[PDB]
């Protein structure tokens, strides 16, 4: 009874014309820090600042008061550049278990070449 992070926090990428939408599926008994969800691209700066779905507020033993996510987290990155070429998206996030321990920040890389849904490769 303690999931590998690969199973506690599962992101799915929806690449469309307006930008990249990320949905995290979050296993029962785990939660995610809104403030630790970050997106970077190579080439850099194709994406603007993320829009976040509504979360909850929690007094946390690690980072104090925080907006967190149970069950799911939704994050939409708008396009800041015209993108016609493939690029890499590096997603950073961090979640915890309700039992009272936290996973380290995790970086997950997506190789994007056009529209559709993308899954993690490892
Ligand atoms: Zn909680
Ligand atoms: Zn798929
Ligand atoms: Zn794996």
From TrEMBL:
<feature type="binding site">
    <location>
        <position position="58"/>
    </location>
    <ligand>
        <name>Zn(2+)</name>
    </ligand>
</feature>
<feature type="disulfide bond" description="Redox-active">
    <location>
        <begin position="96"/>
        <end position="102"/>
    </location>
</feature>
<feature type="binding site">
    <location>
        <position position="98"/>
    </location>
    <ligand>
        <name>Zn(2+)</name>
    </ligand>
</feature>
<feature type="binding site">
    <location>
        <position position="70"/>
    </location>
    <ligand>
        <name>Zn(2+)</name>
    </ligand>
</feature>
<comment type="function">
    <text>Required to facilitate the formation of correct disulfide bonds in some periplasmic proteins and for the assembly of the periplasmic c-type cytochromes. Acts by transferring electrons from cytoplasmic thioredoxin to the periplasm. This transfer involves a cascade of disulfide bond formation and reduction steps.</text>
</comment>
<comment type="similarity">
    <text>Belongs to the thioredoxin family. DsbD subfamily.</text>
</comment>
<feature type="disulfide bond">
    <location>
        <begin position="96"/>
        <end position="102"/>
    </location>
</feature>
<protein>
    <recommendedName>
        <fullName>Thiol:disulfide interchange protein DsbD</fullName>
    </recommendedName>
</protein>
């Amino acid at each position: 009874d303690l999931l590998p992070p690969e199973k506690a926090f599962v992101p799915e990428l929806a690449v469309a014309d307006d930008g990249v939408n990320v949905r995290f599926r979050i296993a029962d008994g785990y939660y995610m820090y809104q403030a630790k969800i970050v997106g970077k691209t190579d080439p850099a700066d194709l994406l603007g600042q993320p829009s976040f779905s509504k979360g909850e507020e929690k007094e946390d033993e690690f980072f104090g008061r925080q907006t967190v996510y149970h069950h799911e987290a939704q994050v939409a990155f708008p396009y800041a550049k015209a993108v016609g070429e493939p690029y890499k998206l590096v997603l950073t996030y961090q979640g915890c278990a309700e039992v009272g321990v936290c996973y380290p920040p995790v970086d997950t890389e997506f190789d994007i070449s056009g529209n559709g849904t993308y899954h993690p490769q490892t």
